């Protein structure tokens, strides 16, 4: 209806609780493997944040897998930084990790993150 | 880290995608029954929005149930309005539904919704 009222902080309050569930390992349903480093997560949050995970978990066979192995060229620290961003809206971008974060975001299909990385690199040139 | 940058619209963009997954019945894992009316949802979203669902899905036995039956006194329209709020931040509060919405929010343990209903009722007295 056009007569709805809206609670400004609701989406942020939901995301905070999804990160608390991840930290306590509550109802996590997939393990993402990056060069033998393992990360537990919720398939719905991964799909909501990435073009790659949206394609994987809408596939009739891959939707039922409990383990997903990423390309061996993907950096575990870069993946960890992006997983934290998915669950908090905060991106830990530093001189020492920006190249790995950008390459991981290109693979995961997160367009706005790729664009921000490109702008930060161009400013230091 | 204290050096993070933040994307303002991220939490709202995630919530929009969680509602799109619900509308297409993608990776929904529970049916909520309200007086023979059935509602499909994601347990993680329900827990993130309600004290009652947080208690139910952290229980060692109830966490594995695929069907949850609510008290027969709960109004299906009131529940539908609150489920839509969980997935969008928008609450369809109207003169004809406010009493049912408030009673449902008290049962579901959604404090700020109860408080807003009370304020809207007090203004019409």
């Amino acid at each position: 209806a056009d007569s709805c009222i809206q609670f400004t902080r609701h989406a942020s309050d939901v995301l905070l609780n999804l990160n608390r569930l991840r930290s306590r390992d509550i109802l996590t349903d997939v393990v993402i493997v990056v060069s033998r480093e393992q990360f537990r997560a919720h398939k719905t949050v991964l799909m909501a944040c990435s073009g790659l995970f949206y394609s994987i978990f809408t596939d009739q066979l891959k939707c039922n897998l409990s383990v997903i192995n990423l390309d061996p060229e993907i950096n575990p620290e870069g993946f960890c930084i992006l997983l934290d961003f998915m669950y908090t809206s905060r991106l830990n971008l530093r001189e020492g990790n920006i190249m790995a974060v950008m390459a991981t975001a290109m693979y995961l299909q997160m367009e706005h993150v790729v664009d921000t990385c490109r702008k930060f690199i161009k400013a230091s040139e | 880290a204290d050096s993070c940058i933040q994307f303002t619209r991220h939490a709202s963009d995630v919530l929009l995608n969680l509602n799109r997954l619900r509308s297409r019945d993608i990776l929904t894992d529970v049916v909520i029954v309200v007086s023979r009316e059935q509602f499909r949802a994601h347990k993680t979203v329900l827990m993130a929005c309600s004290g009652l669902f947080y208690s139910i899905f952290t229980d060692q036995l109830k966490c594995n149930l695929s069907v949850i039956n609510l008290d027969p006194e709960i109004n299906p329209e009131g529940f539908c309005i609150l489920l839509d709020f969980m997935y969008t931040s928008r609450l369809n509060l109207r003169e004809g539904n406010i009493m049912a919405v408030m009673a449902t929010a008290m049962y579901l343990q959604m404090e700020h919704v109860v408080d807003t209903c009370r304020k809207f009722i007090k203004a019409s007295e």
């Binding site: 709805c4 009222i5 809206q6 609670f7 400004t8 902080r9 | 928008r90 700020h112 807003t116």
Partner: peptide, 5 residues
Amino acid sequence: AWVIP
């Protein structure tokens, strides 16, 4: 909080 969206 609440606002008119």
